[PDB]
Design a protein around this motif. Structure first.
Motif, PDB file in Angstrom:
ATOM      1  N   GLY A  49       9.748  -8.070  -5.048  1.00  0.00           N
ATOM      2  CA  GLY A  49       9.536  -7.192  -3.811  1.00  0.00           C
ATOM      3  C   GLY A  49       9.032  -7.380  -2.550  1.00  0.00           C
ATOM      4  O   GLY A  49       8.691  -8.220  -2.864  1.00  0.00           O
ATOM      5  N   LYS A  50       9.165  -6.528  -1.485  1.00  0.00           N
ATOM      6  CA  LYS A  50       8.852  -6.832  -0.136  1.00  0.00           C
ATOM      7  C   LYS A  50       8.478  -5.781   0.612  1.00  0.00           C
ATOM      8  O   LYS A  50       9.291  -4.773   0.271  1.00  0.00           O
ATOM      9  N   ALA A  51       7.305  -5.494   1.070  1.00  0.00           N
ATOM     10  CA  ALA A  51       6.972  -4.964   2.276  1.00  0.00           C
ATOM     11  C   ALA A  51       5.982  -5.375   3.205  1.00  0.00           C
ATOM     12  O   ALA A  51       6.361  -6.648   3.519  1.00  0.00           O
ATOM     13  N   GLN A  52       6.080  -4.038   4.177  1.00  0.00           N
ATOM     14  CA  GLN A  52       4.941  -4.851   5.556  1.00  0.00           C
ATOM     15  C   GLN A  52       4.166  -5.098   5.187  1.00  0.00           C
ATOM     16  O   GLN A  52       3.008  -6.172   5.662  1.00  0.00           O
ATOM     17  N   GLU A  53       3.509  -4.870   3.468  1.00  0.00           N
ATOM     18  CA  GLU A  53       1.777  -4.589   3.811  1.00  0.00           C
ATOM     19  C   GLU A  53       1.744  -4.704   2.682  1.00  0.00           C
ATOM     20  O   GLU A  53       2.395  -4.642   1.854  1.00  0.00           O
ATOM     21  N   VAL A  54       0.880  -5.741   1.885  1.00  0.00           N
ATOM     22  CA  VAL A  54       1.061  -6.119   0.708  1.00  0.00           C
ATOM     23  C   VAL A  54       0.625  -5.266  -0.862  1.00  0.00           C
ATOM     24  O   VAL A  54       1.248  -5.916  -1.731  1.00  0.00           O
ATOM     25  N   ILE A  58       3.082  -5.474  -3.771  1.00  0.00           N
ATOM     26  CA  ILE A  58       2.617  -5.808  -4.091  1.00  0.00           C
ATOM     27  C   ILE A  58       3.355  -4.407  -5.149  1.00  0.00           C
ATOM     28  O   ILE A  58       3.306  -4.413  -6.963  1.00  0.00           O
ATOM     29  N   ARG A  59       2.846  -2.896  -5.179  1.00  0.00           N
ATOM     30  CA  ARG A  59       3.203  -2.067  -5.908  1.00  0.00           C
ATOM     31  C   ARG A  59       4.642  -2.291  -6.299  1.00  0.00           C
ATOM     32  O   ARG A  59       5.206  -1.815  -7.248  1.00  0.00           O
ATOM     33  N   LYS A  60       5.236  -2.673  -5.906  1.00  0.00           N
ATOM     34  CA  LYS A  60       6.995  -2.646  -5.756  1.00  0.00           C
ATOM     35  C   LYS A  60       7.735  -3.169  -6.619  1.00  0.00           C
ATOM     36  O   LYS A  60       8.226  -2.982  -7.816  1.00  0.00           O
TER      37      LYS A  60
END
Length: 163
Positions: A49-54, A58-60
RNA sequence: UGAGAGUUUGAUCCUGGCUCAGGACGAACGCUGGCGGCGUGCCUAAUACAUGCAAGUCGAACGCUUCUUGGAAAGA
């Protein structure tokens, strides 16, 4: 196939890499994630997964991995026989081991093997060292383990005759 | 009885070279220091060598000579 979720789980964030994209102006960076899940009893999977903040990323990834689970047939806390799994440059070799010896395997594949509930095993990466393809190749390898019972039923005769 | 990591890119996968983590030694040098037990010590010039030793023995094979107790044997 589709495995439910009613047992405990374990997580270990294996690796993250800040990734960027360019757009008129500057650059914009994302943070991917790479997490495998298991119950240290013989059920393992991994996600991303990927997101703007770590923490978000990691939850994703965590929530992702829980939808892919494999079996890892074992006998006496060691793989049932020798196997080789390959996926796009991921040569991974695995052989049984002696009791109480200890797992001798590289980093990324160590995380897989451990969370699957493996006690004594040996391995050696061969070629690729990307933290992703290595994991995929590993899981492919595990997907190949045969079994005494399964073969006993498949072939005509019964086990303790296939020795 | 088979463990890997860093480095080409705005970021990606692959091919690919360089570097690191392990051991050992007739070892050398730099800082540093109490011992006991067993080991080892010219790999270079097969270069030149003062000095002292490193191979003699038999009187039951044989004739002589010098002694210490004019003829005496023993020992030297």
């Amino acid at each position: 196939y589709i495995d439910p979720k009613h047992l405990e789980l374990e997580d270990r964030v294996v690796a993250i890499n800040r990734v960027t994209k360019v757009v008129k102006g500057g650059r914009r960076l994302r943070f991917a994630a790479l997490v495998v899940v298991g119950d240290k009893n013989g059920h393992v999977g991994f996600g991303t997964g990927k997101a703007q903040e770590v923490p978000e990323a990691i939850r994703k990834a965590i929530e992702d991995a829980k939808k892919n689970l494999v079996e890892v047939p074992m006998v006496g806390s060691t793989i049932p026989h020798e196997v080789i799994g390959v996926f796009g440059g991921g040569r991974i070799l695995m052989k049984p081991a002696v009791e109480g010896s200890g797992v001798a395997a590289g980093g990324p594949v160590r995380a897989v093997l451990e969370l699957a509930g493996v006690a004594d095993i040996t391995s050696k990466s061969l070629g690729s060292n990307t933290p992703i393809n290595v994991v995929r190749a590993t899981v492919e390898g595990l997907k190949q383990l045969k079994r005494a019972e399964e073969v006993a039923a498949l072939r005509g005769k019964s086990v303790e005759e296939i020795i």
